[PDB]
């Protein structure tokens, strides 16, 4: 009764002398994550997530070796559990981008990150370690129709059906390492020491080999089109066929949220997600 007390044997080993009741537990979908001052401990809730935990550690070790221009959670220990280093710094509010030199600097750092992700996609240690699913967008569309259309109005279903149609048109690219959920909260910064400096990136649960348009769409979602355009132009990705891929994938974000909220039993996320479609 209380995850901390329940796992106290392991925590005394992994964090000797650390009071368990002083820690913190984020409650994930697959994992309970115990937060310590410089590291976290991933405990698999289900026996599905415990079966994949060895795979996940291999992925994190691949990420930790890559040149991304920043930090990633490094596997410190695995045994079942995975201990990861905590990336320092905090998310940057969209507010800070109003200062144009700050915007310039942050855009530049995003470019380095995406470049390194793109470059890493050509590797083999990466390609053979990381998920690389076929037609993930077709499977997604099948899931939306099955699980979400019944929650939707006729106009909603029509609008969503256009969005899923657009997905068929996407090339099934596996060029780059794709974070998969590269929102503002997942990118951490050092602030109050001159202009913001990228510390690192977290929440790699969705990481795969795929299309970087996905990471770009996420940035645009978190910070708006102006800032995304600044990144697109700095990185030389402001072409038409990229823009199309971005827009198509960006339009699945509310539906992705709903689909996961549907499976979660998280009704607030489901309502928020379905706001357009009913």
């Amino acid at each position: 009764m209380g995850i901390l007390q329940a796992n106290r044997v392991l925590l005394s080993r992994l964090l000797p002398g650390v009071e368990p009741e002083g820690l913190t537990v984020r409650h994930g979908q697959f994992h309970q994550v115990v937060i310590a001052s410089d590291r976290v401990v991933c405990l698999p809730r289900t026996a599905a997530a415990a079966a994949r935990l060895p795979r996940r550690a291999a992925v994190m070790r691949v990420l930790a070796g890559l040149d991304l221009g920043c930090r990633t959670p490094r596997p410190l220990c695995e045994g079942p559990f995975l201990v990861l280093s905590r990336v320092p710094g905090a998310p940057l509010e969209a507010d800070a981008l109003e200062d144009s030199k700050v915007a310039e600097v942050v855009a530049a750092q995003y470019v380095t990150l995406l470049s390194g992700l793109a470059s890493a996609g050509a590797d083999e240690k990466v390609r053979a370690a990381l998920p690389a699913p076929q037609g993930r967008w077709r499977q997604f569309a099948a899931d939306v129709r099955a699980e979400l259309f019944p929650l939707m109005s006729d106009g909603g279903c029509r609008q969503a059906e256009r969005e899923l149609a657009a997905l068929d048109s996407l090339p099934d690219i596996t060029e780059a390492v794709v974070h998969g959920n590269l929102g503002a909260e997942n990118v951490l910064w050092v602030r109050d020491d001159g202009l913001p400096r990228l510390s690192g990136v977290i929440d790699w649960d969705e990481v795969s080999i795929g299309d970087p348009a996905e990471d770009l769409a996420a940035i645009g979602a978190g910070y708006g089109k102006d800032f995304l355009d600044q990144v697109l132009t700095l990185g030389g990705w402001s072409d038409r066929r990229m823009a199309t891929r971005i827009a198509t994938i960006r339009a699945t974000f509310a539906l992705q949220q709903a689909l996961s909220a549907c499976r979660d039993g998280d009704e607030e996320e489901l309502a928020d997600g379905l706001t357009g479609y009913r």
């Binding site: 998969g180 959920n181 590269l182 929102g183 503002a184 997942n186 969705e206 996905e214 769409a217 996420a218 979602a221 978190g222 699945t252 974000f253 509310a254 992705q256 949220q257 996961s260 909220a261 996320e269 997600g273």
Partner: peptide, 6 residues
Amino acid sequence: KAXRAA
């Protein structure tokens, strides 16, 4: 999760 993708 949340519009970014969670």
